[PDB]
Amino acid sequence: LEACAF
Amino acid sequence: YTRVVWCAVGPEEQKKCQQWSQQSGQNVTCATASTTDDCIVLVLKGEADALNLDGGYIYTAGKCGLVPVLAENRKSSKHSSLDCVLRPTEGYLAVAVVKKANEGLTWNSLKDKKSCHTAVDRTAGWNIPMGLIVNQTGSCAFDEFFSQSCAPGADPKSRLCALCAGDDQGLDKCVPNSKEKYYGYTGAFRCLAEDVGDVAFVKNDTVWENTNGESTADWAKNLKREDFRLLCLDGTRKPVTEAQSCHLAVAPNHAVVSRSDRAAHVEQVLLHQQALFGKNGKNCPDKFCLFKSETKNLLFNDNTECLAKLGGRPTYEEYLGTEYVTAIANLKKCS
Ligand SMILES: *[C@@H]1O[C@H](CO)[C@@H](O[C@@H]2O[C@H](CO)[C@@H](O)[C@H](O)[C@H]2NC(C)=O)[C@H](O)[C@H]1NC(C)=O
Ligand SMILES: *[C@@H]1O[C@H](CO)[C@@H](O[C@@H]2O[C@H](CO)[C@@H](O)[C@H](O)[C@H]2NC(C)=O)[C@H](O)[C@H]1NC(C)=O
Ligand SMILES: *[C@@H]1O[C@H](CO)[C@@H](O)[C@H](O)[C@H]1NC(C)=O
Ligand SMILES: [Fe+3]
Ligand SMILES: [Zn+2]
Ligand SMILES: [Zn+2]
């Protein structure tokens, strides 16, 4: 439930 | 107009993409990366335009800003008068498949068995079965649930990669691309067919398309459906004819993603390219078929009848569906 993984 | 730069995952997809590029008169051209996450990073950098993705990968891409453009549509189970491009997609069935001869095995006795997965982070191979297992065990320790696995993309020295076999030389063990013998739908079903694993997490279509002469490949050519069973969540085992009542979930179809600013152009080019190379395309089979592979399911699944328009210009969360998104997000809390 957060940001881009890169 | 501009060229569309596709991103191929591994060298077998790159070969296919280079054939498409030649046949397309360079309307499509190719970039290639070793993994699907690396292709998503080329697209986020603007060094590729698009690729077609399993829904679990659509979630990674979507979190990074990429949008769904067109979805795979396979032959419909019901009659429809709509053209393929305008027919609503139906979602595929994620299933757990075992051998009938392995008589003791049910969903409730999976602990400490040997498993075959398409790849980490994919829908039927990983997010659906591991999400159900973490939930039913109440534990994030899913990397210790099966005794050994082939789960391409995991740590190659770990038990999640112990069953993976790499390429003809045994290099690239556990890489999440088609060089790994047990990658993907067909590789994970081969892991089960060869009794490397006890269970394969694939989709319904994979068991049908690799049995009873539907595949002429050596390891498949002699497989019979009746030698496999599906594991139902209520602990029963059924024949593989019963997938509509013995699946783990319904998955959103693989789909093409791009940056938002390139979506429209990628869409227009793809609609044209499948008119030339798609099923019943003008130049398929004479010259090139976009939805067939030298090996298996390269760029697109070989059971794709067309890429279809999406309804409602959907965000990635609308395309995947709220329930699937929430399941992925719950599982990713373990990592
Ligand atoms: C499980 O998958 C198989 C393979 O895609 C489906 O069987 C195909 O169904 C189509 C559309 O009905 C038929 O016209 C094809 O000939 C079938 N293929 C084969 C190889 O038999 C099957 O319908 C799917 N089961 C469920 C419940 O969705
Ligand atoms: C694993 O369990 C979690 C926790 O219950 C599930 O998350 C819920 O899913 C339902 C249906 O989408 C929602 O109404 C709830 O809001 C979700 N709860 C929470 C706390 O996030 C999740 O669906 C389960 N995973 C799988 C694969 O079934
Ligand atoms: C290349 O794209 C241009 C512009 O759409 C079009 O005129 C031409 O037909 C395309 N050719 C092929 C082979 O895809
Ligand atoms: Fe998938
Ligand atoms: Zn269901
Ligand atoms: Zn919307």
Side-chain angles (χ1 to χ4, degrees):
Chain A
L1 61 149
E2 40 163 300
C4 181
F6 322 101
Chain B
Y1 66 102
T2 62
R3 297 190 173 173
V4 168
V5 183
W6 208 258
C7 196
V9 180
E12 297 179 335
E13 284 208 346
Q14 177 182 218
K15 183 179 169 182
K16 183 173 169 178
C17 185
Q18 287 169 342
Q19 291 168 191
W20 184 10
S21 174
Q22 179 206 81
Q23 297 296 326
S24 77
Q26 340 289 311
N27 279 348
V28 176
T29 61
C30 303
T32 186
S34 289
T35 69
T36 302
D37 283 353
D38 288 353
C39 270
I40 288 168
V41 167
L42 292 185
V43 176
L44 290 175
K45 292 195 296 170
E47 293 174 20
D49 286 321
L51 65 168
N52 179 63
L53 294 178
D54 170 76
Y57 294 141
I58 293 174
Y59 177 101
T60 298
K63 284 283 187 167
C64 298
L66 301 183
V67 302
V69 180
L70 295 166
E72 289 185 355
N73 221 355
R74 63 182 181 288
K75 172 179 333 204
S76 176
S77 64
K78 64 151 274 286
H79 186 273
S80 161
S81 60
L82 302 169
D83 181 58
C84 184
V85 171
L86 296 185
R87 194 178 70 226
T89 61
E90 287 181 75
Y92 57 89
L93 298 179
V95 288
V97 195
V98 303
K99 290 293 181 70
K100 175 190 166 178
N102 192 355
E103 297 176 19
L105 187 54
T106 72
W107 181 257
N108 296 311
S109 63
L110 281 173
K111 180 78 171 86
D112 302 320
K113 302 301 180 302
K114 295 177 308 199
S115 61
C116 308
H117 302 261
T118 62
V120 178
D121 284 348
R122 289 179 62 161
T123 300
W126 186 260
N127 288 347
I128 291 308
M130 299 303 231
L132 289 165
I133 290 163
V134 160
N135 281 0
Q136 297 173 17
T137 64
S139 163
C140 278
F142 60 69
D143 56 343
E144 285 173 10
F145 188 80
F146 295 114
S147 58
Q148 299 180 107
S149 308
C150 178
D155 177 0
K157 78 187 168 286
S158 71
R159 285 155 52 170
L160 282 171
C161 287
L163 300 181
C164 295
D167 72 10
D168 273 344
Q169 289 204 73
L171 292 175
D172 281 352
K173 180 185 220 282
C174 219
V175 175
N177 73 45
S178 65
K179 290 281 93 194
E180 159 61 50
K181 185 178 249 183
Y182 302 128
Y183 180 75
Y185 297 120
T186 56
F189 189 60
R190 178 178 184 163
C191 170
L192 173 71
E194 289 179 353
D195 293 325
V196 172
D198 296 305
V199 58
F201 296 109
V202 300
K203 64 183 174 173
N204 163 66
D205 308 86
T206 306
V207 175
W208 291 74
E209 285 173 18
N210 298 98
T211 48
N212 293 34
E214 292 292 307
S215 163
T216 57
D218 194 85
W219 61 266
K221 73 190 177 175
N222 217 23
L223 307 175
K224 157 43 185 184
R225 273 161 217 156
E226 162 58 16
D227 287 333
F228 294 86
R229 297 294 188 251
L230 305 181
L231 301 187
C232 318
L233 283 170
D234 71 354
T236 61
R237 293 159 58 101
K238 297 191 185 191
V240 306
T241 50
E242 309 303 303
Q244 193 68 59
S245 77
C246 183
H247 56 265
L248 310 185
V250 178
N253 283 345
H254 294 197
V256 177
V257 303
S258 68
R259 283 194 181 171
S260 150
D261 24 291
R262 296 285 284 163
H265 183 63
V266 168
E267 175 175 1
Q268 169 189 276
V269 173
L270 283 170
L271 288 181
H272 186 55
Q273 292 294 311
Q274 67 180 4
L276 309 176
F277 308 116
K279 170 138 197 296
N280 327 116
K282 288 195 333 102
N283 299 277
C284 172
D286 282 9
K287 293 162 155 155
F288 179 65
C289 293
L290 188 55
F291 304 138
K292 293 289 84 173
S293 317
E294 270 199 28
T295 60
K296 232 96 182 137
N297 302 317
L298 300 179
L299 306 181
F300 305 92
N301 286 311
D302 297 328
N303 69 358
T304 300
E305 176 182 6
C306 70
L307 301 162
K309 289 184 189 182
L310 311 178
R313 294 189 154 258
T315 63
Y316 84 94
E317 293 178 274
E318 286 171 323
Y319 179 76
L320 291 179
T322 308
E323 282 200 3
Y324 184 39
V325 166
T326 299
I328 296 166
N330 267 288
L331 175 63
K332 279 193 200 287
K333 300 176 174 157
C334 302
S335 285

